[PDB]
Amino acid sequence: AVRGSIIANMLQEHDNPFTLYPYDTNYLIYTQTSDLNKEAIASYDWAENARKDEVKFQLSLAFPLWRGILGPNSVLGASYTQKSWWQLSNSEESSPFRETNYEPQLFLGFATDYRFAGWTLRDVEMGYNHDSNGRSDPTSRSWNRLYTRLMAENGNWLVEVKPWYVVGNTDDNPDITKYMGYYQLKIGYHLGDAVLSAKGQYNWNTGYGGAELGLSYPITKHVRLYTQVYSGYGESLIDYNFNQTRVGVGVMLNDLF
Numbered sequence: 001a002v003r004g005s006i007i008a009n010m011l012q013e014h015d016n017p018f019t020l021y022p023y024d025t026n027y028l029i030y031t032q033t034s035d036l037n038k039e040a041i042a043s044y045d046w047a048e049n050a051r052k053d054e055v056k057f058q059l060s061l062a063f064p065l066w067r068g069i070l071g072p073n074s075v076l077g078a079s080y081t082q083k084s085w086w087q088l089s090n091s092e093e094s095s096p097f098r099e100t101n102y103e104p105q106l107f108l109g110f111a112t113d114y115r116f117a118g119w120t121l122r123d124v125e126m127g128y129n130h131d132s133n134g135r136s137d138p139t140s141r142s143w144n145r146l147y148t149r150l151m152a153e154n155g156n157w158l159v160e161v162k163p164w165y166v167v168g169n170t171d172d173n174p175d176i177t178k179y180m181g182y183y184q185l186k187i188g189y190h191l192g193d194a195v196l197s198a199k200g201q202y203n204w205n206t207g208y209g210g211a212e213l214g215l216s217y218p219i220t221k222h223v224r225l226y227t228q229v230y231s232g233y234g235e236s237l238i239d240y241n242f243n244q245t246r247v248g249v250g251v252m253l254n255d256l257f
């Protein structure tokens, strides 16, 4: 199976066409943020009654569009990642959604076997990424990136680097690279069935950035208990230039590996 190998997983054909493939993690946690960005969402009619406690979730799927496109162990794929912040408890304002980040990708991935002194480069993926919050001005955030995702493992460790280059219109947030940087590092450690993870981005030039620490353990064969702690800038597109520390607990399907 090869833990956390996204590309190798996509090559494994499913009998039922409706059985999709996981790309990033899939979870639904009840959170509590340190500070809520009302300044950015001031245009909303419920902005003032915004609660610091929100239901946060992430949906992430991969769709193999063409296997073996560039030889065996290669694939032309697509993926969809959605992160949503929901003011569920806020019954006073009809439980509105504060932000949703739609993140579809089109890539060319390869399942590899390169040795790096104990480590093994399992995935090499290169593609285009679109990320917008589907909002109308002034609360509209959006940016496009061309990237490369590398994944390597070493026993109970997993490391994934994802450098990128911004392409296209950045008018909705001209300085988004100031807070996001030029790459994303992800680390995962397997302590038996417990999975510890780290995911962050950092601009070494400006000093801005954010990080995410997570810990899961299986409830059953498919679901897991997940605890997350984000801290820094760029949690969501609307909060790309807003700093906050968020803690949440909930359920998770798949983790890093």
Ligand SMILES: CCCCCCCCO[C@@H]1O[C@H](CO)[C@@H](O)[C@H](O)[C@H]1O
Pocket (backbone or CB within 6 Å): 106, 107, 108, 126, 127, 128, 167
């Ligand atoms: C490494 C393989 C990458 C496959 C992703 C296909 C991206 C096609 O997508 C196109 O990419 C262009 C890049 O300059 C953009 O200018 C276009 O707006 C976008 O539609």
Ligand SMILES: CCCCCCCCO[C@@H]1O[C@H](CO)[C@@H](O)[C@H](O)[C@H]1O
Pocket (backbone or CB within 6 Å): 161, 163, 182, 183, 204, 205
């Ligand atoms: C395979 C390992 C790839 C690591 C990706 C790191 C790339 C991030 O590197 C960044 O590049 C920018 C443009 O040159 C510089 O301005 C930044 O100072 C630098 O941090």
